[PDB]
Amino acid sequence: HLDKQQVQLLAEMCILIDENDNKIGAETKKNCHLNENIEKGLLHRAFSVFLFNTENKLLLQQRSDAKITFPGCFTNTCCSHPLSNPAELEESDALGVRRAAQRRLKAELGIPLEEVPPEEINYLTRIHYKAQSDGIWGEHEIDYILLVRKNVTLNPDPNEIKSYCYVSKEELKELLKKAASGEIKITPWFKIIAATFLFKWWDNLNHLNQFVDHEKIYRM
Ligand code: DMA
């Protein structure tokens, strides 16, 4: 009964990890997102991209109604998972995750691979969180937060997103208030980052060295 193309993506192989983000196996995206498996501890690696343009506006997307988890929710630029293959399993300088981010930026938003090569993708820190989308589907990940600063071109896949918009800080606040009123919905990872680190980073977009932490995994 769910969207066919999204169903086909449920077969992708995700990277299973222990609570310290050490790789321990691989499992399908479907199984990694079933609350029944999450309830037993199944945890996978993921990433969340926050992309800002020269005007310092953050690029948001509204997930399409076809997404199996949190459909129609407003959220940050891109969120997905590195796959269990040689290229994206690469742990050196989080290269696997940055390659996966480049791949999904192209697949979801239509950003050319060349505009967002790994060297343009800055890995800030990791956050561990768990949530439920519905009675059946949910999330449980150690999420690599990645930041991109560039004036990209876009050509999104409507199967992935039903809308996108660059927002200023004040515009994001009006957005968050509309979410608090149940007017609109936002994803759990965006809610967590927005309530903790987002605005701090946004103020130091030029000096995010003091905001990089590759040692600690923040437990949210
Ligand atoms: C980090 C995280 C929450 C991955 C979720 O990805 P998504 O549902 O936005 O897209 P997909 O799961 O289809 O790659």
Ligand SMILES: [Mn+2]
């Ligand atoms: Mn996930």
